Amino acid sequence: GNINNKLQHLNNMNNWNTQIYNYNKNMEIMNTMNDKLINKLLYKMMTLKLNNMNINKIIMSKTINQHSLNKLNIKFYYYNNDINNNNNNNNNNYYMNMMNKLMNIMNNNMNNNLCNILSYYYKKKVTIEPIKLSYIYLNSDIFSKYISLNDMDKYNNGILTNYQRMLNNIMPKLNDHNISMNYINNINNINNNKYNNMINLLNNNNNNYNNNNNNYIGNINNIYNNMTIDNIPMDILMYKYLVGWSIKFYNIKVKLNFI
Amino acid sequence: PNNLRRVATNYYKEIQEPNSLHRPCRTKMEVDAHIASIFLQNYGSIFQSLKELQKRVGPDNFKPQRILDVGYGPATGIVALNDILGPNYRPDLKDAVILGNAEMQERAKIILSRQLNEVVDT
Amino acid sequence: FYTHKEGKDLKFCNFQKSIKRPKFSIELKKGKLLATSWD
Amino acid sequence: MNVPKARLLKVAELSAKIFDQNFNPSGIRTGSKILNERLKGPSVASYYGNPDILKFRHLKTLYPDIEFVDLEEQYRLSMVEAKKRRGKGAPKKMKKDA
Amino acid sequence: GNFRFPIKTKLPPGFINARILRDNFKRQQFKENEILVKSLKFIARNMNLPTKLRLEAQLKLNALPNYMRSTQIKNRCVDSGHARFVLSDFRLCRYQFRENALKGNLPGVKKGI
Amino acid sequence: NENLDFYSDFILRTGYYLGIPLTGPKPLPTRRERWTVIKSPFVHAKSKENFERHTHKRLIRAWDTNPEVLQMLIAYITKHSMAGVGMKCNFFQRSEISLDLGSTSAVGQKVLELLDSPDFKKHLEK
Amino acid sequence: SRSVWKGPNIVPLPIREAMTKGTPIRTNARAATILPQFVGLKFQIHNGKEYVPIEISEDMVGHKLGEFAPTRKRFSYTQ
RNA sequence: UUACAGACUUAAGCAGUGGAGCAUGUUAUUUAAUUCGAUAAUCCACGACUAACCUUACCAUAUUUUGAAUAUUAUAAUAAUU
RNA sequence: AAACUCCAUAUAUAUAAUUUUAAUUAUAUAUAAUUUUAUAUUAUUUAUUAAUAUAAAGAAAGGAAUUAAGACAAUCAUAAUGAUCCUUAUAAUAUGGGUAAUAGACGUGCUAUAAUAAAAUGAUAAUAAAAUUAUAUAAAAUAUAUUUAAUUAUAUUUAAUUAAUAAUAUAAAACAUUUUAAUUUUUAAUAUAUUUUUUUAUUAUAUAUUAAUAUGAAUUAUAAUCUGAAAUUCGAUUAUAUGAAA
Ligand SMILES: [K+]
Ligand SMILES: [K+]
Ligand SMILES: [K+]
Ligand SMILES: [K+]
Ligand SMILES: [K+]
Ligand SMILES: [K+]
Ligand SMILES: [Mg+2]
Ligand SMILES: [Mg+2]
Ligand SMILES: [Mg+2]
Ligand SMILES: [Mg+2]
Ligand SMILES: [Mg+2]
Ligand SMILES: [Mg+2]
Ligand SMILES: [Mg+2]
Ligand SMILES: [Mg+2]
Ligand SMILES: [Mg+2]
Ligand SMILES: [Mg+2]
């Protein structure tokens, strides 16, 4: 149920940053080494400068290297605080900020896209999917990098009484028990809606000999009546609410508990 | 063994305290416990410090004829001196002020009767 | 000062020398009292 | 075992001929093993990875429009200037000509 | 301008130190001369050839530089450079293996039961 | 196992529409690799962390199919492969005993070159 | 012990000059096998620090130069 | 300063081991080097996932000098741009 | 923290055209226990109770990981940051040597000091598990040591397999038979037997000896082999000889 549904558990393949299996072990070692090196290279491409006093630091998570039989997809989460033009105007619709220029060389640039260069390094098709996170406390890796690299002036002379206060009012204190029990009630309701659907579809009769071998209950519509994409998916999704967080201060040691 | 070992352990336990200090022996068992566990490192401390005197003053310029040794032990200073200055050394005066239990003096006779610098003159 | 938590860097002037162990010293330091660790 | 050795040797020789195998009835050391061992050079020479990786120094010409900053390099250069100001700089290196 | 090794070689892409550079140089030159060394070894060990040719091959083999010797290649940690306790399944030392393993960097490695 | 089983199920669906009788996925024995990492104490305390890697295996067999259709199956499932899954394919082609038109090593070449060089010819002279 | 069928451990050495001039042969090839030709010639064999002078006799053929140039000093205790 | 309980440990019981040769680590000593590994008095400085070369960190001799990096400024050889 | 969770175990379903065969299996999913009930006895806070035993049901009996603080240790040759010092040298390369030296001492192992225990032999081949093999695992056969053969070691050759397929690899102890110094407790020559692989009788079968043998395998001589470009300092194996301590 929890591990038999894609929306209720994290696939164990996601526990590893390099998702690969090659019969040729040497090629697997090489691909693993190539993923660490490219990850380091990408970390060096996140710091950009427009002018001497305009340095935009994009905070990037570690890369997720999905190695399939035909291609390699490099997925990473990034956070960027747009401080140069944070207005209510539409001036950003007439120029490409530095972060858009950086993201457009990953795949869009027709002559020197990073994917084609990497496609020769790996000898396979390569795609890069940057995914933008709007808050810095949605990814443990991004959160640690921000503090470590950007909040130094706040904890270099002790943790400021305001800095700590901000790190304690990030999220409203949700009641985990009530949220946990609401989730369990929704699952019971969905489970009891399907059992009722089948019980009714059986009691209504939707070869007596064949009525002892086959298990086909009837039309798919009736079995899944009132179970649609508009009500089932979002209610069963796990790890949807931040309910705990411990930061430590050099070496930043952030831990987030998403339930 | 076990009996003497315990008395030796007690003194060792006392001196373990930070910035602790030595003290005179109290009983006869402590005299033996000191001559077995504390005399050795005291003999070496006096041996490496009198050889420093003999070299930094001059091997010829170091021949004291009146010696006084004071410590919580069986004339350890005299025992060290008799070794550093050879078996033919016979200074005029050698007074050892053993500041502890009276048994230590009897043990000192035993130790110093095994050095040829200290034998009755005929 | 040394015994305090901040005197653990203080350096005092001591000298170390190596001396053999006689038989009586070896014999004495045998057992659960003198030869066994205490921590 | 009762099969005459001459007969079993004729079968071995003919069999070796059909299967393109080396027939050495005497047993003299021929070195054929050396000629058949696989070459391990390519695997050994790739131990440390592919040397033709994109490097930060190549980014200033691949993407002239974008100005990248190397924080590790930048940190080092600031530490060099700091030591020069404290008088703890590096001695001028002797020239071989001298 | 003054490369430390007789022949020009490309640098490894990752962590670099003097020992890694020396080992990497030996690895590249072993590959360039592997066939040559096998051919001389064959001539020197083929009893069908005259002793003079066999001894000539052995002399040529003894005159090759040390960087062409297969037995001088040493597996080192590709992340730290250490040469002890190096696992060949990952080319990492036991300490770097544990750190990478716990970070999820090794493709299928999990903590044992 | 999760992607392995899901992808295996997809292959069976692809084959059915292609007209390929398929059997499986048959689970093969899982391989376990193990590594022990002694920690800093090595004092016989909790001084040896253990690690392991499990290779999950599945076998899908194809029967009574023409080579062209079999190649279409492999091409399609290759195009839509999942992350972290490897695939080995053994093809079996029944043929006739006698066919039409059918179905030098580097070291040896260098040896001949070396034995012709003057440093070797100067001795082979008889 | 090198297999006899492989032959001697032959190393490049300047033997012609030592046979036409009588000069000593200074060498670090301690593994070299003393061939029967060497008999009578004078060798200076490295021991790690110095070059030990040694003349080869007929009872030294087959051995190796390193065997006659000891590399360590005899042990002694401060009794 | 009182009392209580529980510890960890203790000894008890059982089954192995305690000297010999060799293997291996340490110490001391030696050595051109025997790479490195310990000093506030009980005891106690231990790296077996492989030291012939390599490893290597030590010794002797010889040899190299912007060296493996990044940048600056020149010079060229080369390809594009213009 | 515990619960929970996973592993193990029992069971169910699914998968395998049961020649990749181990279906007595493989691995996905699910279930099960932190067991349950009656009865008698002894205690109790005596009740809707614990400790006990008795009976009944059950395959059910074992593990794993897990909080934050506080006080303290390690150079991590297992990663850093600064300061500090070297910059023709405290950086770099090559050849050789050393890390393997040897008075004493200590730790940890190995093999032994013989009969509730060592050595041989056991082919329609007694009986495992877990691993490994593209920087390979190497079958059978033949040749030599070497003898009918086997065994062991190496060479020649390189079958199959890059693997639930072939190979490393016929597990070993066990068990049976034979043998075994000390041991005159033996062996041999005659005779003898209703113990016959054996009994008995008479003769010889050494003395030495608190002791080291047909126990033990250190040390050492000689010859050959394996890896490697190279085995001298300083590697591994085999044969003949040597046979220390205990
Ligand atoms: K050697
Ligand atoms: K079967
Ligand atoms: K060495
Ligand atoms: K025995
Ligand atoms: K077996
Ligand atoms: K040797
Ligand atoms: Mg090696
Ligand atoms: Mg060395
Ligand atoms: Mg060297
Ligand atoms: Mg050592
Ligand atoms: Mg069998
Ligand atoms: Mg065979
Ligand atoms: Mg058998
Ligand atoms: Mg047996
Ligand atoms: Mg004896
Ligand atoms: Mg024997």
Side-chain angles (χ1 to χ4, degrees), chain B residues 7 9 25 46 79 90 99 113 115-116:
Chain B
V7 177
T9 314
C25 298
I46 300 165
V79 178
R90 297 184 85 80
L99 283 182
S113 190
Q115 276 181 320
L116 310 189

Side-chain angles (χ1 to χ4, degrees), chain B residues 21-83:
Chain B
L21 290 171
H22 292 281
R23 57 169 190 81
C25 298
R26 305 264 75 93
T27 80
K28 311 195 178 182
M29 187 58 57
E30 290 187 11
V31 175
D32 301 284
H34 172 91
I35 296 161
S37 77
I38 308 288
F39 162 89
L40 190 73
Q41 298 199 352
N42 282 353
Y43 170 95
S45 63
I46 300 165
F47 195 92
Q48 182 71 10
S49 301
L50 277 178
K51 270 206 176 303
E52 187 84 3
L53 179 66
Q54 191 170 42
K55 180 177 200 187
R56 277 62 184 93
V57 161
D60 303 352
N61 308 341
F62 177 52
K63 294 180 180 179
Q65 300 302 312
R66 300 166 297 175
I67 307 89
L68 157 63
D69 180 40
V70 184
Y72 316 117
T76 313
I78 298 296
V79 178
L81 190 71
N82 292 338
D83 290 312

